[PDB]
């Protein structure tokens, strides 16, 4: 029972106004309802387009890190 509920802090609507309000709010709600897991596609990632010095620490902290983050 530990979830955030909608609160009507002020006002005492009757069942009809409550129903209208909830219907409108549900209609307003949207966006990604139950989206699939976002597909990984590292092809042509910006990090791969950079010039790295042969001894650059960013070869570890930026390039390898980006390729390995999962």
């Amino acid at each position: 029972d530990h979830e955030a509920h909608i609160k009507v802090l002020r006002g005492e609507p009757t069942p009809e106004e409550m129903a209208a309000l909830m219907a409108v709010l549900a209609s307003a709600g949207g966006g990604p309802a139950e989206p699939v897991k976002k597909e990984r596609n590292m092809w042509g990632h910006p990090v791969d387009k950079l010039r790295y010095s042969v001894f650059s620490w960013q070869r570890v902290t930026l390039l390898e890190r980006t390729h390995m983050r999962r």
């Binding site: 509920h5 909608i6 009507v8 005492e12 409550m18 129903a19 909830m22 219907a23 209609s27 709600g29």
Partner: peptide, 24 residues
């Protein structure tokens, strides 16, 4: 899809509200 139950607090009292699950 099935219906869904939201819980709304109106001045401190709990109130259930069942809605179609297809609203979007």
């Amino acid at each position: 899809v099935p219906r869904q139950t939201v819980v709304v607090e109106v001045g401190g009292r709990r109130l259930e509200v069942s809605l179609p699950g297809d609203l979007a």
